[PDB]
Amino acid sequence: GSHMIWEQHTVTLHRAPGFGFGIAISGGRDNPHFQSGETSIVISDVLKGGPAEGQLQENDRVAMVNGVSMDNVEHAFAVQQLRKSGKNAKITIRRKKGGGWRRTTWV
Amino acid sequence: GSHMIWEQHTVTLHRAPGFGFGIAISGGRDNPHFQSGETSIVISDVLKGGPAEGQLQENDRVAMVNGVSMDNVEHAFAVQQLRKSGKNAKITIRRKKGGGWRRTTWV
């Protein structure tokens, strides 16, 4: 295991016909993760071969959309900021790396 | 998503030559999970086609080994309780089900 770090990535997505931006938005201060209590806006899924393929990943935390902070915002507010975008959505995310435990032993 | 539940399972494992019980032990009060801070003893991995196959799963929390509680014990104490077992190890675990979020929206 290793201590957590979060790599920051900024991308610009373009809408595809019938797919939208092709990302699933979860989290929000009024919509915490059931296991952790975490309130961050989160990319919880990514559409296969959609606009976000190879750019965004499951579990990415959304920090900003088109210059608007996602810090401690409600679910609908994040959804509305993305939905109201035109051809492009500029999105900055933090992507977790690391985890596990200091010690693990096979028995 | 759904609220978490943990299904309790008790199994009796028998050692196989060259594999032991075929489980990886992590967690402990002196060995918390790097992301969650969780101190439970945890089955963090299971050997392919070993004694535990189809019986224990990655992320199972260990509650008891051979009548000895694992509640808030140190990593080495859990390891020693398993290691000192003869042919059989009776193990009770709690297995998480559920998670996610109340709301998820595709954009």
UniProtKB/Swiss-Prot annotation, chains A, B:
First and last residues shown, out of full length: 18 to 110 of 1748
Record note on domains: The 244-aa domain between residues 633 and 876 is the primary occludin (OCLN)-binding site and is required for stable association with the tight junction.
Reported tissue expression: The alpha-containing isoform is found in most epithelial cell junctions. The short isoform is found both in endothelial cells and the highly specialized epithelial junctions of renal glomeruli and Sertoli cells of the seminiferous tubules.
Family in the record: Belongs to the MAGUK family.
Biased composition, class Basic residues, residue ranges: 89-97
Compartment annotation: Cell membrane; Cell junction, Tight junction; Cell junction; Cell junction, Gap junction
Function of the molecule: TJP1, TJP2, and TJP3 are closely related scaffolding proteins that link tight junction (TJ) transmembrane proteins such as claudins, junctional adhesion molecules, and occludin to the actin cytoskeleton. Forms a multistranded TJP1/ZO1 condensate which elongates to form a tight junction belt, the belt is anchored at the apical cell membrane via interaction with PATJ. The tight junction acts to limit movement of substances through the paracellular space and as a boundary between the compositionally distinct apical and basolateral plasma membrane domains of epithelial and endothelial cells.
Domain called PDZ: residue spans: 10-97
Gene: TJP1
Species: Homo sapiens (Human)
Protein name, as recorded: Tight junction protein 1
